[PDB]
Design an enzyme around this catalytic site. Structure first.
Site, short mmCIF file in Angstrom:
data_model
loop_
_atom_site.label_atom_id
_atom_site.label_comp_id
_atom_site.label_asym_id
_atom_site.label_seq_id
_atom_site.Cartn_x
_atom_site.Cartn_y
_atom_site.Cartn_z
N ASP A 183 0.80 -1.21 0.00
CA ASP A 183 0.00 0.00 0.00
C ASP A 183 0.84 1.28 0.00
OD1 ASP A 183 -2.23 1.46 -0.18
OD2 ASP A 183 -3.07 0.92 1.79
N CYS A 217 -8.13 -2.31 -5.18
CA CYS A 217 -7.13 -2.47 -4.14
C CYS A 217 -7.83 -2.24 -2.80
CB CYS A 217 -5.95 -1.53 -4.38
SG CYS A 217 -6.41 0.16 -4.91
N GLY A 222 -4.82 4.15 -5.68
CA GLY A 222 -3.37 4.20 -5.88
C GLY A 222 -2.86 3.02 -6.69
C1 LIG Z 1 -6.24 7.09 3.04
C2 LIG Z 1 -7.14 6.37 2.07
C3 LIG Z 1 -6.32 5.48 1.14
C4 LIG Z 1 -6.01 4.18 1.51
C5 LIG Z 1 -5.27 3.37 0.65
C6 LIG Z 1 -4.83 3.85 -0.58
N1 LIG Z 1 -4.09 3.06 -1.40
S1 LIG Z 1 -4.81 2.10 -2.48
O1 LIG Z 1 -5.75 2.93 -3.27
O2 LIG Z 1 -3.72 1.57 -3.31
O3 LIG Z 1 -5.50 1.01 -1.77
C7 LIG Z 1 -5.14 5.16 -0.94
C8 LIG Z 1 -5.88 5.98 -0.08
#
Ligand SMILES: CCc1ccc(NS(=O)(=O)O)cc1
Ligand SMILES: [Cl-]
Length: 280
Positions: A183, A217, A222
């Site tokens: 993550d 995810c 991300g």
């Molecule tokens: C703070 C909220 C948040 C949590 C996790 C992620 N990463 S992710 O989108 O790769 O799961 C992005 C944002």
């Protein structure tokens, strides 16, 4: 500015320029992308009746591009339609299902004629919950709302696991689980994700009649966004004289917040393209 296409013969030098002086130009570029799509509301996701349906209170689909369930806001799921290289609803991006939304998730998969699901988080990472375990786990069967899911097969490899399910409302669903992507971070090598993406793309191409490919995810921004960007740009490499990483991420951001969520992810996309081109 919505696009920055780079001739393939110029990409190596381009990325070097971006990297110069501690990523000065790269950072500048990535910062621009952060404004993209920001004029758009998320009112539906914010309705009181929907509060429990969001994993993160600050990661919500735009009203303009959200996926609606058939049928009050019984229509709500935290998921967004995303264009790809090929068509406008090429992917559905979603958060990691919650215990109380996994029936909604499977309903969406059914209604949207999804044949392929890509999961790029683990359910728990460094002791923190990221995603519910939302499938039947050993050649068995479970109900999810009005649907029944049954595991047909599971193939475990070192960096991903591929599962096949039958869903009855009998479609076959393939589930591609990449298990080594931290993550807010990136995989240890470009090679690993490049291979995973090429594998998924091979299955997608072999899926006649499929609706959107689901990618998720934890937050659905991300790692999901980086996956989709890489899928798009690798296709560009195979078929075009230029590659447009900025344009891909721009287009993602128009459709959902935070897509490609850290600068290191944006760098990684460039490293992937650089490494493919070096090998070629
Ligand atoms: C703070 C909220 C948040 C949590 C996790 C992620 N990463 S992710 O989108 O790769 O799961 C992005 C944002
Ligand atoms: Cl929705």
């Amino acid at each position: 500015k919505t696009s920055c296409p780079i001739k393939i013969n110029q990409f190596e030098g381009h990325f070097m320029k971006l990297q110069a002086d501690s990523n000065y130009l790269l950072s500048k570029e990535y910062e621009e992308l952060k404004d993209v799509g920001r004029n758009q509301s998320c009112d539906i996701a914010l309705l009181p009746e929907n509060r429990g349906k969001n994993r993160y209170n600050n990661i919500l689909p735009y009203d303009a591009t959200r996926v609606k369930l058939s049928n009050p806001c019984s229509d709500y799921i935290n998921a967004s339609y995303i264009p790809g290289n090929n068509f406008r609803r090429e992917y559905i991006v979603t958060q990691g299902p919650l215990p109380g939304t996994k029936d909604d998730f499977w309903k969406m998969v059914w209604e949207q004629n999804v044949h392929n699901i890509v999961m790029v988080t683990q359910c728990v990472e460094k002791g923190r919950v990221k995603c519910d375990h939302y499938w039947p786990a050993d050649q068995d069967s479970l109900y999810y709302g009005d649907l029944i899911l049954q595991m047909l097969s599971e193939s475990v490899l070192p960096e991903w696991t591929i599962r096949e399910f039958k869903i009855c409302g009998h479609r076959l669903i393939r589930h591609f689980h990449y298990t080594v992507w931290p993550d807010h971070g990136v995989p240890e090598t470009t090679q690993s994700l490049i291979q995973f993406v090429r594998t998924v793309r091979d299955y997608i191409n072999r899926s006649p009649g499929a609706g959107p490919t689901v990618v998720h995810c934890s937050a659905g921004v991300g790692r999901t966004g980086t996956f989709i960007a890489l899928d798009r740009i690798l296709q560009q490499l195979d078929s075009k004289d230029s590659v447009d990483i900025y344009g891909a991420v721009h287009d993602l951001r128009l459709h959902r917040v935070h897509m490609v969520q850290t600068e290191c992810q944006y760098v990684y996309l460039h490293q992937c393209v650089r490494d493919v081109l070096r090998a070629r």
